[model samples]
Target: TSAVQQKLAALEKSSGGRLGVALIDTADNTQVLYRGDERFPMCGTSKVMAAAAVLKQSETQKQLLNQPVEIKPADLVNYSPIAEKHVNGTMTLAELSAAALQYSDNTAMNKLIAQLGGPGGVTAFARAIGDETFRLDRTEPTLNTAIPGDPRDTTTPRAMAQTLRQLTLGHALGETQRAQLVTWLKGNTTGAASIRAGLPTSWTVGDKTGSGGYGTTNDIAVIWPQGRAPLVLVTYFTQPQQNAESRRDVLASAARIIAEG
Candidate 1:
């Protein structure tokens, strides 16, 4: 833990931002908290929870996972690089989830939200994990009406990250299903420049990143050090302003400290 703190002390100063980081070593079941009580904008990180909602919701209802969801004309969003190449069509619940969770596709996420029974369903998922502060109040395609303390989606570092770790340990889903989600995250390319940036290539990291305007960049992941037991890490950063490279480095530097410490 001290190793992580020392590194963040340096990076936080150079980066001119506030940093919130949490790392849970699943092997030993130890946790490190640095600004872990603070909330962060969980843009795509919410997709992690959203995916959980669908799985749990699907479990409550039989064969719901295989149901088809048609991507409407309105669901096609300009910001989604993953969806840009494809024309509007139908996708199964599983396909839509793959797009949303692995690629952070906004339009795909919207479709998932609607499928999982909207924000209330997501709240149900959050409740299962003991997080009360999170809310999926708005979709990404909408304008910016979110207040600072009242974002459309928000979660504390400890709350969201620990929930992810529990999900990985197969609390929310079966071991096989959780394994599939972990595999998809391992292949996720959306956050290549965020938490995964500047890290050693051989070390496998499964992560989801959230993009915000000038003030925020969030990345949460289960990182495998030396291909051994995985460590769950969450880094949520915000400031008056900062560049993408620097924000990502804040996370990468912290990840390095914990992994190599």
Candidate 2:
């Protein structure tokens, strides 16, 4: 507890009043660290949940991961290079999922959500995994509108951390499913530095990051080493005017401190 407390105090001090953190170390059955309510806005970190939902439904339905799916122009939420290249339309579900996880591509995410039965599908999947605070209440089918006020995507830190733990334990999906999910998460491109920092290089960390223009940033991750118990860490930051570098370093430091503890 002292270890965690010290880390939290340092983070709050370094962030200069523009940060909120929530963390859970399942190894010891403790929340360990937190600086705000659990229901703060989560950026792309929510995509990890979305990805798990898709994998669960796809596996249950015996859907082929490599199977091709069409990409419609309507699915493009932002002007992403990958989306532009695929203007001819159509790519595999696997490809879309890759884009979403690897690039944090909004268009790819929306398409994958549609493939998984839309927003309701992701919500239902999360609920099944014990994420009671998770909800996707949007009427629109675009990922761009899934922000805090959009009512399409809402998550509490506790719920998000719980979702990660479920995935790690193969409770949300099966053992095989969990392994696959970890692989994808390790490949996540968003919020990489934040959650990946402060951990031993020998420890393999799987993480996803989320940030919006509204000054919200979040990272959800799991850390594993050969012999030590794993850790589930989630950090959130909201700064309306802070630069990207500042937010990234603050969050990374937070993750590092918690893991070292």
Candidate 3:
């Protein structure tokens, strides 16, 4: 715990007044740091829940992982390099899951949610797992408009931490479902460059990041070295110049400090 607190203090000093973080170590279901409530807009970090929802539904239906599913331009939501390549193309459910988890492809996520019973289904699954503070409010037309106090599509940092804990322990979903969830999360690729920076190369870090306009920048990850216990770290930065340059350094610094501790 001292190690985690020291890391948070260092991050606060360097954040330049624009940061919120929540870290949870799954090894003991312990919270190392929390600077804000969990209800913040988690950006693409919410994809973690989306991934869990898909796996749960798949397991219930006894669906085959390799089942083929077609992708269409209309299914695409957020723009990404991978989605652009597959626009109006056909891909299997496994491929879509990989694209969504590994690349954080918005189009692939929306398509997968549709297949897993839509946004409402995901929300229901989360609620069942005791995640009342997090929810998926809409599916179509995308909730891109930023309206202050808008309750649509949001989750709290505390709720996210809890969700991650449940996921790692296979508590929310059954064993089979949980294993599938972990497999998909391990494939996540986008936010890793920032959050996992400076960690021991031999250590294994599982995480996801979310970034966008409206001052959104956030990451949640669990780091576990070969001999040390597992630790979860969540960092959020909201500021005027939260572009790729400014935010990446902040996240990297936080991860480095955490790793050293």
Candidate 4:
């Protein structure tokens, strides 16, 4: 753990950015927390919990996911490429969940939030799943503001890792729902250069990534090493300056450090 800390510090110094990490070896429950308690904006990554909440809500309300949702122009927001195509058209809850989790579609997420009764609903779901520190106070676009040092719509690395572990590997959702959640995350299209890029080809990954103003970039993943139990890893990185460029390499480098150690 000490060895990993030195490398993390060097990376932060060279990049002029802060990096927070939370990693858990599922096999033995060993944890590595590097500034894991600091708050970081959730940005688009909250879609994972949003999606999980949809699934959990569906488990109790049968046929909920099969219900069709219409996407209007008002629902569309910046970074909603997938949702844009279906404007005025219809998509099932399952389809919307997939779009939000796999593609980080802003519109899809907003609609999902509505299904849960808004941002508070998502937060309630997080609490129900044993994550007290996760919060979502706003909807899309506004939620991505990511002001430096703001606590609204933010989560700690350790809290996020624990939340992800519960949703992905614990018994928070129905078995079928958990499997579907993993499928969407495994096919995530936004993490090409983040955690997934640092792992060896032999390892399999399911991840969700987030990006917002103030140079905020983050990723949370459940990784499966070839022959071992899976690991849950969360990385949150941000620059002090607003609108600063976010580097995916910082997260990839962090992932490599933990993977190698």
Candidate 5:
């Protein structure tokens, strides 16, 4: 193992849990992988993929993004903070996508999932982008059950990082759509304490975080170190113990190690 990977492996060992990481430095094409093939709960980290799907579909439909949709209490689910703030309000499809990506709003996500048909739309988008390990078997809250070892709504670190790379830096979405998705990701409110927190204050980062039962806390990010090539990092941390607390510090430590690399 390289010095960076050795530190990460040691860090994972000390955590007494599982840590799967995948890092890609686009500037020089440097890669560091540790348990990158293992599956872990997606949690809200799937919002970015869902948002990308919505934008992709809108690109072809033209008017899909501008159309308004009604929201009621019935549409709300656990942790739908943004939607709950505007209960029974009307929001355009674009607005919902923003809420889902920027706030990790579960209601906005479920609504957008329905807009593209269902959870399968995101999965199909992942498949089309060549990420075979991503699957969204259920909607929010329910999907967050995150039973240890269950693969229903899980993705591998490598696959998730690849998907993020494709959507944010590759050709999966049109330029307009991709820019929109990146903007939303950069605006994300839920990732502050995870990987983003581990970086230098001057660095720019766009990320999405996932939290679920069984100590599942995940963050996938695009990091731009000043004067360097951007890096794509995926960190998935989980403990098999039931009701265990998800640790953001573990992710931050991992991010710090990768940044130093």
Candidate 6:
């Protein structure tokens, strides 16, 4: 194994979990691969591509974003940290997309899927972006509670890294929409201790996080090192569901290794 691969493998050995990781150079699309082909539950992190679906379809249809819809009480979710302020209001499709990403809001996620044409449309969007391995088997809440292989949303690390590449290159979305997604990811206030913790101060990382049953802990990111090209770092750790902390540590450790590398 190469030095970086060996380092990442050593980090994975410290935790009892099934893990997949990939780091891509943004400039050339060249990859540093490590178990990048294995699949794992995307969980809430699917919101990132969910954002892409909305943007891609809009561009294809030659339409702008969706109109504002009144927020029904049913539109509120039990898990959304931002929904508390959604008490009385309407939100545009763009805003709902932001909500889903900023906090991985469940209600906003359903709004995006349903308004975008359901699960099949989301999968179509994935394929449209050249993602053969991406799949959305169900919507939120269901995805949140389902067992393994019980119609779950899933993706692979390499596919996700390519996705970050596509987004940065404006393949799947227009400039405005891509900017919005990047902003949401950069401002993301969730899961600050995992991959986020290990990043160097000289670089900035915009990322999306996913966590689920069966000990699924995943992170997908676009990282920029000062005066250097950006990197796409994708990681997944699943197993030992009984104690999830081990997976997070491995992610942090891997991040530090990548940064130092």
Q: Give TM per candidate.
A: 0.88, 0.85, 0.83, 0.98, 0.97, 0.90
Give the per-residue lDDT of model 4 (tens digit) for 168-200. Answer: 899899998999899999999999999998889
Question: Cα miss at 13, model 3 (Å)?
Answer: 5.3
lDDT of 2 at 97: 70
Instruction: For each candidate in turn, give its C-alpha RMSD to the true structure in angstroms.
Output: 2.6, 3.1, 3.1, 0.9, 1.1, 2.3
Q: Candidate 6: TM-score?
A: 0.90
lDDT by candidate, in order shown: 0.73, 0.67, 0.67, 0.92, 0.88, 0.76
Give model 1's clash tally: 0
| Count of backbone collisions in candidate 5 | 0
- Checking candidate 3 for backbone clashes, the offending pairs are 38-156, 38-157, 38-158, 39-156
- For model 2, the stretches where C-alpha displacement exceeds 4 angstroms are 1-3, 139-152, 241-246
Each prediction's number of clashing residue pairs: 0, 3, 4, 0, 0, 0
Q: Candidate 2: give the clashing pairs.
A: 44-210, 138-152, 198-256
For candidate 6, which ten residues in a row score worst on lDDT?
A: 143-152
Best candidate according to lDDT: 4
| Residue pairs clashing, model 4 | none
lDDT of 1: 0.73
Better candidate number, 2 or 5, judged by TM-score: 5
Best by TM-score: 4
lDDT of 1 by residue, 1-261 (tens): 476677777777888777888888887888888888876667677888888777776666767768877766766875676565455667777877788888788887887778767777787778867767777766665412223565567778888778888777546776556786788788787778777874677778888887665456778998777856777888887766434333676777777666666
> Between prediction 2 and prediction 6, which has the larger TM-score?
6
- Candidate 6 per-residue lDDT, tens place, 1-261, comes to 889889888777767677788888766767887788877778887888888888776666554466775677876766765555665787778777777877778888888888778888888888987888888978877675424544458778888888877876454678777776788788776657667888876678888877777777777888878887888888777775544543576677778887776
Q: Residue 26: error of model 2 in Å?
A: 3.7
Candidate 5: tens digits of C-alpha lDDT, residues 167-238: 998879999999888888888888888999899989999999888888888899988789978889999998
lDDT of 3: 0.67
The local lDDT score (0 to 100) that residue 253 gets in candidate 4 is 93
Better of 3 and 5 by TM-score: 5
Q: Is candidate 1 or candidate 6 better by TM-score?
A: 6
